[PDB]
From a paper:
[name], like most archaeal cells, is encased by a paracrystalline, proteinaceous surface layer or S-layer. The structure shows that the S-layer is pseudohexagonal and consists of the repeated interactions of the Nmar_1547 (hereafter, NmSLP) S-layer protein. At the sequence level, NmSLP is arranged into ten immunoglobulin-like (Ig-like) domains. Collectively, our structural data reveal that the S-layer of [name] functions as a multichannel exchanger for ammonium ions, featuring negatively charged residues that line several pores in the S-layer.
Our goal was to solve the structure of the [name] S-layer directly from whole cells. As a result, we produced a high-resolution map of the [name] S-layer hexamer from intact cells. The central region of the S-layer hexamer in the map had a resolution of 3.3 Å, with the resolution decaying to around 4.5 Å towards the periphery. The subtomogram averaging map contained sufficient details to enable us to derive an atomic model of the S-layer. The first eight domains were well resolved in our 3.3–4.5-Å-resolution subtomogram averaging map. By contrast, the last two domains appeared less ordered, with the local resolution decaying towards the C terminus of NmSLP, away from the centre of the S-layer hexamer. At the N terminus, the C6 symmetry of the hexamer is broken, revealing a distinctly two-fold symmetric central pore. Each monomer of NmSLP in the S-layer adopts a rough ‘cashew’ shape, facilitating several interactions around the hexamer of NmSLP. Although the amino acid residues (37–1499) from the first eight Ig-like domains could be unambiguously built into the subtomogram averaging map, several unexplained densities were observed, emanating from surface-exposed asparagine residues. Another notable set of unexplained densities was observed near the negatively charged amino acid residue side chains of Asp73 and Glu74 at the central C2 pore, as well as between NmSLP monomers around the hexamer.
Numbering used by the authors:
A (entry chain A): 435 to 1012
B (entry chain B): 1013 to 1373
C (entry chain F): 37 to 506
């Protein structure tokens, strides 16, 4: 910084100054509240990253030239440097038949995904006839590992393997983030990796566990200290960028050893092809993600969301220091908390990334984005910005106090936390499954029983404080005072609206980011009362009764109130008759 | 100059569960640090499904040191090694909970700072700045009911101590640097003083400086309240519970089982919760399903209850005496949780009006 | 606003971008040199400073086709069989133009000619397949390679090149000296001249003419920001055609022809051997046999396809047992219901497939074909000229149930619902006397199943479910 070169034309020399600039990362919400499902721009003004005045510079984790990338993280995600500075080496050779890279495959089977890793090394033709060591560096916020090594690009160069140890990290340092999916009530594990800088045709990644040192590696035919030391995660993936959901086999294998977790180290393995050229600097980014909750899951101690989010800011103009990005966040609800797709559907590395929020993080816990910067003075001072992501108290009400027969009642639900995408229209279907306890209820088929009710129960409609459900299953054989069954009676009466599912009543958002859901249905003249709600499937009464005079009540289950917890809110109305 | 502050002047006494005691299963606490339901909710033995969850109160420590605010608009962390000391004192004896500011590490509990080696003490990690331009660092630390000075008053419970080090054992040495004295157990009593120690590396004079803030453990009685005395059957009952010691965390609003309250009337006697008689909890239809605190730093719990027309196979009558009694387990006269079993009840009337019958002629 | 030089990639809709194995047509429509009987000269057309050989056609316009060398090699690496997929033909050294094409082509980085090789030497003949890793090519081609060709016309990326000017008197074939002038079936025309371009770096096409030069600037970068998919409506009735408008620049490989792509979009076919894939030129733009189908799933990464070259379809978002979207044979496709069992019906989308390519496009996999709306508009559509879509809402679809279609990793939900109608009779005066025709107005969005045509009610049409009656 400050050293300059003089380029002279027309005997009027111009000085080429080298330097740095004070940055300022700012988050500008479109309104006064950063509610869920609202993509808001992220503006970064940093002249240090504007290295070309005639083109557009886009940040990239895979680009070693882009040194500094903004990052956001929640909880304690297992990054590549949780155990300190890692050690990475490169190796050329063959894996052999007794290796997990070739025999192993993704099948969620213990034998298929968990095994042993063996190799043979032939590095005689390499320089100094030694394994390719490298210099390792870690960024403080993006946690990117930058590997410095010889930039040999000869045609005869051929390398296939890559073994990296996470410093002093062990199974103890992994179990704080990686959780046992079999024992936890709700829990998923995700593995995100970025090896685009290698330029390999196919990429394979395996997890290694051993009680000894990782470098140098050993083989099964040499020693039998460890019963198993290989856990395959990725096998011959054609994409270097991938955010894949780990199978239950990996979680089982993490807790599948009876030895002391602190006495066994962890190693990460790489197998790839078509990487016969290595640049001066290479970047390796692969972390672990985890989300879910345990037992009742109401307190903050049992709510966890371990993830790291990096923003791929893009330059606004050819010669503009202002880099523009955006942040998306979805507030998890009782419906998608048990679905792994919503956690796997987020983009960890993109220009508009998204992340999960488990609790109304405000004040000191508000989502804060971090970005290092080299200031004008020369220090690497960080610049950070944060924006609160609070929750809202869901309010559900009906258009009228009284309703006639087939009056087309409409349910208006206003709660901004259920908007999980500003682009797509958010919808909520009704469950049609007699086996599940949430039959004829808005939500998802998957349902767990907790202290606050049913996890899959979002919205219910009740006549005389009794849930309106269609007779189905083997528990609807009651005939009542006459010989006609309730379902047959409803069919004879011509009422095709035998239940909530029959009417097709679903919640649909008013707009892309309105956050208000509107749903409606027509009140039937006859309905079948549920005899008892203590069994699944529900046991229905043998005779139907006319809904007139009964009070129609709805109940929207709010997973997160204004303080960020479960509060039961509903509205009341009566079915009028003349 | 550095400054350290605590969220509240007083804090409730933490309570444990049955799994934290080596005593055999009993239908009564028998002096243990257990918070079960009122006797009718237990069937001859207190098991894991009929007591309140673990009551480790989470105290948040905050310091206001502009010196550590190196970045006016960036993330800052208090990286000074062992600058913050958290300890509990009961008279002439002291016990330290741990250290903060250094790298997070595993460690045991020291008594009176007797352990010269500091690496064996539990470390909570570096405190994080609340806002990029605030300069105030907050650390969330939870205190177990076992994290206190040894005393003979707590021998009523054969306490099982959760290990703070890498071992999975439940022995005393796993959590504390030394074993408790014979006939005494580590615990916290009523009136104990909770204090936070912070050593400023540079005060206004640029030297070492020690600042302290203190809080006192206490236990208070519980009292019910209602918006009115008489209620129409089937109406909405705004059952309000005002009692300070259930406010374990000031930063969030906790929830506690409605089973703590019990229905007492001629119709039936039940805990109105999931542990009650068949069909009970459905009759009230709680909204929310359990006691919910009004605000994160209020201590008042409210819940909407519907008056049942029938409790269990029988109706509820007009003019019936409604008794809502709950056991505090922590009254003012209790030295610790589970010592005194005082009960408090409330009287509720049902609507009474003249059921006059008239004819046209 | 150029006067004579027109470039295919020049497009204000897509901001002059270019990506992938695209072949870029350069046409010089110049009235000064349009005649084809005089011994006129070649216009000076260069790109990035490198000269671009131009051939005059029977229409009086000079043509020239260029593409990136690395992208062309990578794409031809997927051409298992000749004249199929992204086949660029056979590559040759830049010094082989004089021996093969009869005119010098030194200033390029390699030429892709539609020859085939009978004596496949390692030195004297080019690469029929091309290096999958890209890079410079040094394989040379000679006259004996031409004389030994057993099949001419293996190029499948330029299929509608105009006929070169026939030789006569003082004029040679194309006025530059091609050996064989048969277009679209010969060994010389069309041919692509490869050039080295830099991703994210601009490409400048230049035409040098008296009175002022004409230059066009193209950007050679990933174009995922423009790849978008749109649906005609928001709510879709029970049997309405599902119309997809795919505005993607990358899919426009052939500039002089309408391009056809085939996708395996079955997102829930959990068979291990099956994966979501894309195919090129399975069918012609007329719905005829377009050639063989070749794998491209593992190659899209090297083809500058950042989440903008794959298609996957979700037919049941809620997994309620009621499929929403199915597929049919069209005039631009040869889809066949392989599972012709009477137990199932046309609603089982997994019953449809392609007979010729059952290896990957067999039963299941939901083979979906798209055709470009125009030869060079860069916009593709499932619906054909007869308005028959490739996707239908199932007739037994449950209300509220919705399906989602995925392109550019941007899900598009296909909701199912209706609208409130209002039939009104408006007399011309206050009394409806005899012999007075008065209009009847019906406002019903459910019957408006096509946004680009007029829907007339008909008793004879089973599709028109509801008709007013008196």
């Amino acid at each position: 910084r400050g050293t300059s070169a003089s380029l002279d034309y027309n005997e009027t020399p111009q000085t080429i100054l080298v330097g740095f600039s004070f940055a300022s990362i700012d988050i500008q919400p479109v309104t006064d509240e950063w509610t869920s499902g609202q993509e808001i721009p992220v503006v970064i003004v940093d002249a240090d990253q504007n290295k070309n005045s005639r083109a557009d510079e886009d940040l990239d984790l895979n680009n070693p030239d882009v040194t500094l990338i903004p990052a956001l993280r929640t909880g304690d995600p297992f990054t590549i440097d949780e155990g300190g500075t890692p050690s990475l080496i490169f190796t050329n050779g063959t894996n052999g038949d007794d290796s997990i890279f070739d025999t192993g495959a993704i099948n969620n089977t213990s034998a298929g995904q968990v095994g042993n890793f063996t190799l043979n090394i032939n590095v005689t033709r390499f320089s100094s006839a030694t394994n390719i060591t490298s210099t390792e560096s870690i960024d403080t916020f993006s946690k990117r590992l930058i590997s410095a090594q010889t930039a040999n690009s000869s045609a005869n160069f051929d390398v296939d393997f890559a073994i990296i140890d996470l410093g002093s990290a062990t199974l103890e340092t992994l179990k704080e983030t990686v959780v046992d999916e079999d024992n936890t009530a709700v829990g998923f594990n995700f593995f995100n990796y970025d090896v685009r800088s290698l330029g390999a045709d196919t990429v394979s990644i395996a997890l290694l566990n051993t009680t000894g040192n990782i470098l140098p590696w050993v083989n099964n035919d040499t020693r039998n200290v460890d019963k198993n030391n290989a856990i395959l995660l990725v096998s011959n993936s054609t994409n270097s960028q991938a955010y894949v959901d780990l199978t239950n086999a990996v979680s089982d294998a993490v807790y599948g050893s009876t030895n002391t977790d602190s006495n066994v180290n962890i190693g990460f393995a790489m197998y790839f092809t078509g990487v016969g050229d290595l640049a001066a600097k290479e970047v390796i980014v692969m972390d672990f993600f985890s989300f879910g909750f345990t037992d009742d899951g109401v307190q903050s101690s049992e709510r966890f969301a371990n993830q790291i989010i990096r923003i791929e800011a893009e330059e606004t103009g050819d010669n503009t220091s202002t880099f523009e990005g955006s942040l998306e966040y979805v507030m998890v609800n009782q419906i998608n908390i048990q679905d792994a797709g919503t956690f796997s559907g987020i983009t960890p590395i993109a220009d508009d990334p998204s992340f999960i929020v488990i609790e109304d993080l405000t004040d000191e816990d508000a989502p804060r984005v971090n970005y290092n910067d080299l200031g004008a003075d020369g220090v690497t001072t960080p610049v950070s910005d944060q924006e609160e992501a609070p929750s809202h108290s869901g309010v559900v009400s009906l258009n009228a106090d009284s309703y006639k027969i087939a009056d087309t009642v409409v349910i208006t639900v206003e709660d901004l936390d259920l908007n999980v995408d500003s682009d797509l229209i958010d919808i909520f279907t009704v469950v049609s499954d007699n086996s599940k306890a949430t039959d004829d209820a808005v939500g998802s088929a998957t349902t767990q029983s907790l202290s606050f009710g049913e996890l899959g129960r979002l919205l219910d409609v009740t006549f005389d404080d009794v849930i309106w459900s269609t007779p189905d299953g083997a528990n609807n054989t009651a005939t009542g005072n006459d010989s006609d069954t309730c379902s047959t009676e409803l069919s004879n009466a011509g009422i095709t609206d035998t239940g909530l599912g029959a009417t097709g009543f679903t919640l649909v958002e008013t707009g892309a980011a309105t956050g208000v859901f509107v749903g409606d249905f027509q009140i039937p003249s006859f309905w079948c009362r549920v005899s008892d709600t203590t069994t699944t499937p529900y046991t229905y009464a043998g005779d139907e009764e006319t809904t007139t005079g009964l009070d129609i009540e709805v109940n929207y289950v709010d997973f997160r109130d204004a303080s960020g917890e479960i509060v039961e809110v509903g509205d009341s109305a009566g079915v009028r008759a003349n | 100059t550095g400054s350290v502050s605590l969220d509240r002047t007083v804090y409730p006494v933490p309570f444990g569960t049955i799994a934290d005691s080596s005593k055999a299963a009993n239908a009564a606490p028998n002096g243990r640090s257990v918070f079960p339901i009122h006797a009718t909710g237990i069937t001859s033995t207190i098991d894991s499904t009929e007591e309140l969850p673990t009551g480790d109160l989470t105290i948040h420590v905050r310091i206001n040191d502009p010196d550590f605010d190196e970045n006016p608009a960036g993330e800052d962390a208090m990286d000074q090694d062992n600058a913050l000391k958290i300890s509990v004192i009961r008279g002439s004896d002291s016990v330290v909970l741990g250290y903060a500011g250094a790298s997070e590490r595993t460690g045991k509990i020291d008594v009176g700072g007797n352990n010269g080696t500091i690496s064996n003490i539990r470390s909570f990690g570096e405190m994080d700045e609340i806002a990029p331009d605030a300069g105030i660092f907050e650390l969330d630390v939870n205190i177990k009911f076992t994290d206190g000075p040894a005393s003979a008053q707590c021998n009523s419970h054969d306490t099982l101590y959760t290990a703070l080090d890498g071992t999975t054992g439940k022995a005393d040495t796993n959590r504390f640097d030394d074993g408790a004295a014979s006939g005494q157990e580590y615990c916290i009593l009523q009136g104990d003083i909770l204090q936070v120690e912070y050593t400023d590396p540079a005060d206004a004079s640029g030297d070492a400086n020690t600042v302290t803030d203190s809080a006192t453990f206490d236990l208070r009685n519980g009292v019910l309240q209602s918006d009115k005395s008489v209620y129409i059957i089937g109406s909405d009952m705004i059952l309000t519970l005002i009692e300070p010691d259930f406010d374990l965390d000031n930063d969030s609003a906790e929830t506690y089982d409605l089973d703590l309250i019990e229905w007492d009337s001629d119709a039936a006697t039940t805990t109105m919760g999931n542990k009650g008689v068949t069909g009970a909890a459905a009759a009230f239809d709680p909204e929310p399903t359990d006691f919910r605190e009004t605000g994160d730093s209020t201590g008042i719990f409210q819940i909407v209850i519907e008056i049942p027309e029938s409790l269990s196979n029988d109706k509820l009558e007009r003019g019936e005496e409604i008794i809502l009694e709950y056991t505090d387990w922590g009254p003012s006269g209790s030295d610790y949780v589970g010592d005194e079993d005082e009960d408090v009840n409330l009287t509720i009337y049902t609507s009474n009006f003249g059921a006059t019958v008239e004819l046209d002629q | 606003a150029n006067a004579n030089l027109f470039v295919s990639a020049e497009n204000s809709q897509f901001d002059n971008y270019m990506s992938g194995p695209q072949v870029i047509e350069v046409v010089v429509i110049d009235s000064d040199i349009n005649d084809t009987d005089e011994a006129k000269g070649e216009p000076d057309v260069t790109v990035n400073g490198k000269v671009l050989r131009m051939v005059q056609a029977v229409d009086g316009n000079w043509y020239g086709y260029f593409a990136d060398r690395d992208q062309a090699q990578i794409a031809d690496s997927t051409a298992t069989t000749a004249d199929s997929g992204l086949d660029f033909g056979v590559f040759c050294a830049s010094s082989s133009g004089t021996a093969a094409l009869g005119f010098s082509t030194t200033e390029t980085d390699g030429i892709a000619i539609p020859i085939t090789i009978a004596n496949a030497t390692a030195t004297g003949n080019g690469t029929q397949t091309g290096s999958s890793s890209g890079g410079a090519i040094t394989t040379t081609c000679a006259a004996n390679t031409l004389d030994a060709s057993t099949a001419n016309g293996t190029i499948n990326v330029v299929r509608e090149a105009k006929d070169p000017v026939a030789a006569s008197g003082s004029v040679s074939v194309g006025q530059i000296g091609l050996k064989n002038g048969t277009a679209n079936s010969g060994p010389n025309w069309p041919f692509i001249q490869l050039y080295e371009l830099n991703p994210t770096g601009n490409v400048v096409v230049q035409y040098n003419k008296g009175g002022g030069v004409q230059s066009t600037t193209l950007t050679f970068d990933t174009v995922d920001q423009f790849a978008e998919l749109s649906l005609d409506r928001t709510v879709f009735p029970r049997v309405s055609q599902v119309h997809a408008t795919i505005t993607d620049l990358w899919l426009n490989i052939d500039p002089t022809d309408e391009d056809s792509w085939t996708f395996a979009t079955n997102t829930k076919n959990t068979t291990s051997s099956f994966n979501v894939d894309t195919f090129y030129q399975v069918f012609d733009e007329n719905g005829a046999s377009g050639g063989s189908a070749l794998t491209l799933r593992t190659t899209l990464s090297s083809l500058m396809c950042e989440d903008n070259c794959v298609l996957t379809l979700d037919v049941d978002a809620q997994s309620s047992g009621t499929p929403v979207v199915t597929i049919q044979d069209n005039g631009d496709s040869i889809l066949t219901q392989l599972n012709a069992s009477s137990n199932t019906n046309a609603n089982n989308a997994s019953a449809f497939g392609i007979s010729t390519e059952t290896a990957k496009l067999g039963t299941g996999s939901i083979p979906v074909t798209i055709t470009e709306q125009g030869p060079n508009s860069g916009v593709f559509g499932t619906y054909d000229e007869s308005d028959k879509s490739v996707l239908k809402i199932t007739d037994n679809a449950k209300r509220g149930t919705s399906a989602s279609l995925d392109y550019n990793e941007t899900p598009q939900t296909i909701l199912v619902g209706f609208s409130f109608a209002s039939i009104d009779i408006q007399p011309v005066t206050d009394e409806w006397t005899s012999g007075q025709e008065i209009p009847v107005v019906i406002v019903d969005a459910d019957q408006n199943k096509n946004s680009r045509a007029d829907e007339d009610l008909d008793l004879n049409n089973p599709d028109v479910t509801l008709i007013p009656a008196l």
